[PDB]
Design a protein around this ligand. Sequence first.
Ligand SMILES: Cc1ccccc1CNC(=O)[C@H](CCc1ccccc1)NC(=O)[C@@H](NC(=O)c1ccc(OCc2ccccc2)cc1)[C@@H](C)O
Lengths: 222, 120, 237, 235, 198, 196, 212, 233, 250
Amino acid sequence: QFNPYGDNGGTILGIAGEDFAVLAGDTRNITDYSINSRYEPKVFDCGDNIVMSANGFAADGDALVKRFKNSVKWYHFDHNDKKLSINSAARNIQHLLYGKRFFPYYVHTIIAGLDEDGKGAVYSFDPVGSYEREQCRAGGAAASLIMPFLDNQVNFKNQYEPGTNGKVKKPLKYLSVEEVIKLVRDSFTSATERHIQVGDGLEILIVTKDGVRKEFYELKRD
Amino acid sequence: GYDRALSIFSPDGHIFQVEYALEAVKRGTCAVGVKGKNCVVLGCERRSTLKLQDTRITPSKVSKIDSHVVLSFSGLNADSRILIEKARVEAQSHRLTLEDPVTVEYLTRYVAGVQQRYTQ
Amino acid sequence: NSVFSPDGRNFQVEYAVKAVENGTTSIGIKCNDGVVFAVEKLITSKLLVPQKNVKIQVVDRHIGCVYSGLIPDGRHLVNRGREEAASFKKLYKTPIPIPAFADRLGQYVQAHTLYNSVRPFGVSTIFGGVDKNGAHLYMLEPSGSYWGYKGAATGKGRQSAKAELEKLVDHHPEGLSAREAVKQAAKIIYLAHEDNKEKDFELEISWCSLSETNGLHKFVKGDLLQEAIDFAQKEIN
Amino acid sequence: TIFSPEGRLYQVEYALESISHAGTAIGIMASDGIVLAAERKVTSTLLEQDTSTEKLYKLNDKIAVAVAGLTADAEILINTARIHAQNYLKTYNEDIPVEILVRRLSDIKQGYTQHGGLRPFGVSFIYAGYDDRYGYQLYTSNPSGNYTGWKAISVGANTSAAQTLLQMDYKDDMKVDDAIELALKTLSKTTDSSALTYDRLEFATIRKGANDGEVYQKIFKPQEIKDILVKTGIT
Amino acid sequence: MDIILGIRVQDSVILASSKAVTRGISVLKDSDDKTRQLSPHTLMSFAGEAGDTVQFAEYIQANIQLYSIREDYELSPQAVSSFVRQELAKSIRSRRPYQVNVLIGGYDKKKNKPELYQIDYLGTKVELPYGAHGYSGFYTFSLLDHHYRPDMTTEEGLDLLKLCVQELEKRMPMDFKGVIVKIVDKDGIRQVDDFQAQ
Amino acid sequence: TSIMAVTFKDGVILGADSRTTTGAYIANRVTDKLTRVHDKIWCCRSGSAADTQAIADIVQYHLELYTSQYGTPSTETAASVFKELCYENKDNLTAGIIVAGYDDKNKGEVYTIPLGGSVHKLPYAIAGSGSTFIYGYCDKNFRENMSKEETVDFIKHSLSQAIKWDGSSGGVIRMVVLTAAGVERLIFYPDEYEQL
Amino acid sequence: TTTLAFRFQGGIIVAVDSRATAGNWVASQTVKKVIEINPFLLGTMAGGAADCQFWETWLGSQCRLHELREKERISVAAASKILSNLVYQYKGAGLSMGTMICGYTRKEGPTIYYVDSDGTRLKGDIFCVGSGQTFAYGVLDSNYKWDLSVEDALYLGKRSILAAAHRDAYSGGSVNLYHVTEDGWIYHGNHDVGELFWKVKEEEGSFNNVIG
Amino acid sequence: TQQPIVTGTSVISMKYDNGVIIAADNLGSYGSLLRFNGVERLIPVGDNTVVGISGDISDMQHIERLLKDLVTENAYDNPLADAEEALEPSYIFEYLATVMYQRRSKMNPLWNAIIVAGVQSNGDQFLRYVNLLGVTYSSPTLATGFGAHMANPLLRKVVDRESDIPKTTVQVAEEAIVNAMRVLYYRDARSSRNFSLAIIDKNTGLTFKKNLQVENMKWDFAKDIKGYGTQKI
Amino acid sequence: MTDRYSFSLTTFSPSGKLGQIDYALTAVKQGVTSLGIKATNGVVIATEKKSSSPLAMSETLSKVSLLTPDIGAVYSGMGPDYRVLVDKSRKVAHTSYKRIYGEYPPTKLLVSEVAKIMQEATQSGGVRPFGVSLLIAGHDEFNGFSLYQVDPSGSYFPWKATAIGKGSVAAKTFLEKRWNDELELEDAIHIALLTLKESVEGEFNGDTIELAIIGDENPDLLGYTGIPTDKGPRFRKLTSQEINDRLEAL
Ligand SMILES: Cc1ccccc1CNC(=O)[C@H](CCc1ccccc1)NC(=O)[C@@H](NC(=O)c1ccc(OCc2ccccc2)cc1)[C@@H](C)O
């Protein structure tokens, strides 16, 4: 029978800082054991200082990103050019996804930007529109290799002050953008080493109160 | 189907069909309502074209909508049935979904709603 | 419209014709291996971008359409024409014969004289092309009526244009060439402007010829247009 | 279906006007039954009276109607009323109460009065029926969708003359036989013919069928009208 | 499995309905009332599929109540049950049928008789001196075949049920948390609200 | 089923066996699989008899309506109509049609529509369960511009091999000759063709 | 998931865990399973995150619309029945949600309704819903009393969630606590199981199943 | 819900310094029966785009038709049809990608894999893939079917990453393509000796080569190979 | 495109008339006279075949039509209206009755069905009433022989004998004088032939007269033998020849 779904690999990573957020993903696109492209970007500037990635089934990802970009466009038309806040985007995205509750977009969606206080914000969604704001989130093929690392290195979980015997948790700091990119690039080199669907290149998008900046690093091509 | 506009504005800003409806009301028998301290009373009359009637079986002018609210009317009897039926259905539907009988004001707003809709 | 008047005629169609008679003059000329279409474009103002308000329309790749009267009505008709051409091609593979295309517009136009809820079309449309067996020229009136023509004209200067065409036909029993009919169309458009000359005009010509365009509809641009505008200017001084 | 400056329904008034020219039908209600009597509009010698019906129709087994107005308009409404009774019986395994069927027919009529742009039905009905909630019942419905109950009532031609005479001779404790007699009397005087012959009449009764504790519908045969016309001194 | 019992004595009808509501591994409620009043003299009890059960009952109730107010009159138990049957019979052949079994117990003021109707989700209706839906019938039917008499008092009818419940509390695998008992007679519907610790 | 159509100098010939089976039972041993959709446009049917008969009837209808409005349709036009029906309804159809026709401009032409609904113009074409067994033979023996008596031979030989090996093929061999001349029907009996 | 809500002398306790899973994968430990519909109405969530999240956010809209239409907050009875009716329209299509609608009104007092995607709607004093429900019930039932002090009841709810968080693989994260009175819901904090388990263990002297 | 019936195998493509090359063989298979031998699976659209299609042939013939009347439609009321408002490779792709994805979303797909090769009016190389699921990607080299598995490895040896593209000439690229077509003929049971190949260059336009053949094949070593293990003669 | 007159074209006027129905009756008045006569063992319907030019073939025009094997119709008024009413009537005899009960409808019920179709044109939006009056002559096992008249209003009534159209007044009188309840079929044919002689201006022969009977069953008009429980149709059109033979003895 015809199967309407595929899996194009592919891993995405969102980290929120004090006055910035990053959304990064690999640039490799795959089918089964083949590489379709080594540079097919999947993290997009959607306007209004929002970056978005829908990882999983690439056809569904694209359809969703297209529709959110159109959603942003019509929001401007219908609401006197108002800036679409990140929380408002998040909600609008839940509705996009949930509209297809009975024929879902096969994607894990992460969006990043700044909340209305200028703080860095990351929201993530499941295929059917359940969402949460978070400090950080991994998505796609290697999410399971990365998330635990992030719990350990972004939220200092299971880390205690030496000598307090085990009675005082390591204090929860904010990370700088230089510090966050180091985690991203390490998370991704680790994932390239151990997951066959992650490799080729890494494209990081950084969002601050002066727009959206882009960076690209190579990944192991095997 | 047929949807030729009947209720329309005149140059002076009156909707003549709505206006002539009021004329039909002023044509019908009288009804009076007065509320007391712990009660409300309704009162009507009957006309005289003939008087060989059977009044066991002829519709009274006060209608029960739900067990706690009544509706009386002046005007075309035939029209009033259609409002009474609709009002009665709504009262049951309100109990079914709100788990509470209608407030008198809610039932009124509904019946007035139906009347309004038939003006446009 | 769904109303016959007591003389057997249709008074709504009759009035549509008035709207047509009131329009810009446009013509068609059949030639030995194609057709040539031309039209008068009134220059309302100096502010019209020249060449940039195109009146002649293509159907499929091989049919030309030009019309006089209510321009929007004409555009509506061509849109229908194009669906009619795609529907035929889709089912039958071959591109649509011109006679067949004539009846498709014929029937559609005629339909709008059947019901009181619609008005007839405020255009007479001249159209034609090269198909599997020859060139064809047609004119279709607001009533739906159409016929094949050697030459056709409609609009404000239709009488003077029809007279000119009659001259050509009678003095060229051996048929006219595509190259010639282009120049003659230019002449005839200049000679229908006489009956409309309070405003300035722009000439527009298209053609469809087996030898000159491979049986495809094409616009007469550049040199060949200028050569025609010259020929027409010459035979008025 | 539109209002006049005065607040009357143009087509309805004209429909009633139409009915005022139709052959007269009468309903009379007794303690032990109901009488239905109707006069046929100016007829001929060759008009078949045997296999004929036009003014009295059976709705179910407990309900009949008398017709004043357009026969064909009436057959439309008779047939859907017959169906409404059958839907009711199928749903509840009980016969339709007389009032309920009457309200439904009157609601259909009312429809053509408020929406659709179609002409109202040119029909008035006299309903004779029995049910175990109210017993014998006589109703009237006209093109306006209005319905009222009656001890005795007339519809169609000459209802004014008819109503005076019934109001004069009707009394609450009447038996069906007196009601039959009154029905013929009234028609005798209201007719636009020389005399009242049997072939110009339709006649029906809804009785307690002598012995059974059950309800019977009798549509009088041509011979039976001819008979009932003799013993009442009309020959 | 859900106990829905009905027994018709001489002057009244008695309905007993189990109190447990159980989803999966948990008993969520021990005091559920598996019954809706259709009119002052007509009571319906129901068991079956989780959602449909109450929606159907309430949908029936609203319709009967609507009819009541429209005619200022109470439909007979027989008329109510035929309505309920027809509803189920239409339902069985629709896209997603109501999976609800019911007992209708009423007192017919015109005839002065009590009446018990058993109707399954397919729309199979029958009048019976006693009835049950589900597994409970596999025990109670034969028990009542023995002990039941047509001319019993209401008080005797309540002893017959005490026996029925006892038997079901002994031999049914599941804990149905006792029964609510209701009597429908000439006066109406009342609850014998002291049957479990009686 | 064994069906074939072959273009040659003067026009085109359609050929077919005459056997219809349900299972291993022969429902009809004298079937006429050569189907006229227009004076000089014919086809051969394989797949479901129901489907191919329904399709051939609608095509016949469309071509009749075509003629009344627009003169004779070309053979390509007829193939397009077949294809439209076969492709658009591919899911609920099992139809393998060969279309062949004679035109004045284009002379003989052959179009094959296989299961999906694709169209293919070919010098000759073969289809039906019988055809697998004659791919080698036919490819080795077909020449362009054969004479009428040569084309009849080629069809006769090919179909007899097809009939020899396929259980679902058999009976008589039917041919229809389509040229300027006219339309000619031909039949050949087992005693004739089994000898070859 | 483990969610609970019980009724007592001092109003209503509502407690929930905060774990979201997909298969055996722990998706989040910091998830909000209580929805605040208005200052007087709470909704709890178990089952499919999207289903509960979407339809209960929607519930809030229907409840707000009722306030504007009728000029008066909606009853718990009717808010529960809006959800329960919607969810019934979708029966068979695979929606998966088990929820409780909790609140106070003047007409009803403190009220709890259980609502699930089967269509079940139940008024009741005590409910536990989710994959840890049985673990919560265990602790809750054996310590519940109507006369519990507001302070004791808050602890019991919190402790019952801990019980389920510990034993049920699919429950954990933290406890979110709510108390509902006449004056409206009052949030009583987020309690990480990381810290709360050990505190409770040492202070209460329970969890002797647990190594060191 | 359907199944491919008559099908045609790999389409292969790569870009070089001044344009794109696309190739595809001329076979239409019917299962394992190599049924039709003259099938053109490269579809030129204007003089800047070529559309190579693999998969179900009847669907390919549908897509052909769609592209032709897309050209017709574009000319309508379009005085700049042959200049600024000429159909672009990017427009043709986005149209097809739209269609493909709608058709899958309706559970009735066009059972194809498509590569759109062309040159944009600004001189940019266009190379993009879309298939029956609506999945789209771009890469210096693209191939469908067996081409994905066998051709890509060979073509990527010439253009591994983006920066290799100004270093690759038409000669080197065409040679890599022609060699890949040979390999595919060696190892793809659904492949054919005859193929078409189109170059779209920003300077030269569309060069459309029909009736190419696979030459310089190695078979001689076959003669020394006997048995499947121990057999000596 | 579409219908834009969704209101009734027949409405009540102040006096209570329905104008469009009256005007349809005036149209019927101009119609060529037609009549029906009911015997004890048959019914006869007959009309004039008014030709327009002797180039017209009057036999090709059916004025007397078979509706069912036992029922027939004839009309006065607008021929084209009658023709479409005949086709609807035949179809409805099947859809409403034969396909349900496996037997043809009795006369009153088919008449009722035609009446329904006519009534609906009296009330539906965007239509004029039918401009015909029909005489329908039929036989059924439980009602025997009957004759009905259906008017533009949809009203229908049973007649022992009647005539409609141009010379209706005159002919109704001629029949009143000649009808008794004891007539054999051949007598009614004779009376019908006499009544029809008063109407016609020009020629009066078998090619200007159309005449049908509903009599006994004709087995030879059935088309098959071997099921003894149908003996054929009761409807028969009299041939040109047969009309002339009754004319010489007139
Ligand atoms: C109550 C609630 C409310 C808020 C937060 C948490 C919860 C608790 N609740 C869960 O943690 C559930 C338990 C599993 C459960 C799921 C559903 C029903 C009952 C139990 N998890 C989820 O809903 C997660 N998503 C998923 O599990 C999925 C949702 C959609 C998917 O799409 C698959 C797909 C795509 C295309 C075609 C076909 C299938 C895959 C995973 C989500 C925390 O990311």
